[PDB]
Write a protein that binds this DNA or RNA. Structure first.
Lengths: 115, 117
DNA sequence: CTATGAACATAATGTTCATAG
DNA sequence: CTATGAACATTATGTTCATAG
């Protein structure tokens, strides 16, 4: 893949993985949390990208689905996420550190030569 | 609705590099490619030739640069297409955009790198 | 070989519609 | 309305081929 910058889905997948570590999340939650979290910097990911990233982590057997009901005040069906293979997660999280690390390096090298 | 505001595209990354190298040297596709291929090899980014040739032809169609069909040799006789500035303000302006781009891009990586690890 | 470029190919990610609380 | 998707569309890019020096 010509060794360029970290793909978007990898960038999300990383975020899902970490947020599963702390809370229980589903698609539209993570999206809105991210949408907010970045708004300033200016990155505004779409929903279908999130749902793609998620289903990969499924097919990769890192995570698994549960069809629960998060009420609050209503009675809505919502697909929540938990770890299937948490070693698998740990491993991928480490790869993504490496990825981000290069990604930083490139940006900082470009940013150094050209300006 | 945007290009969702994520990381800098590859072609921008190259276009940037062409623009700066034109400032300093005369360059053509295969030269810039090999220079970049080397320059990054450690970090691990190995761009291909057709990506380079795309980036170049944009800068053309954008009227930043223009072709110069010459024969830089040494011990040969061989056509290479060097580029020079067509509209150098146009360049300056784009280079500034790309600073902005790179600046966000850093911000994102550093933010992701902060939260998740 | 180097070099350029078209043509073809698919990968990554955006947009719209279907369908269920 | 939210939430999940699937379907459809396009752009951003990798792979290979036709030329020529």
């Amino acid at each position: 893949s010509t060794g360029f910058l970290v793909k978007q889905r990898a960038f999300l997948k990383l975020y899902m993985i970490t947020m599963t570590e702390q809370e229980r999340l589903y698609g539209l939650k993570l999206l809105e949390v991210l949408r907010s979290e970045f708004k300033e910097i200016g990155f505004k990911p779409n929903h279908t990208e999130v749902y793609r990233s998620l289903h990969e982590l499924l097919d990769d057997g890192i995570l698994k689905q549960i069809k629960v009901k998060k009420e609050g005040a209503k009675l809505q069906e919502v697909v929540l996420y938990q770890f299937k293979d948490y070693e698998a997660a740990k491993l991928y999280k480490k790869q993504l550190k490496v990825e981000l690390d290069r990604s930083k390096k490139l940006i900082e090298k470009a940013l150094s030569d050209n300006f």
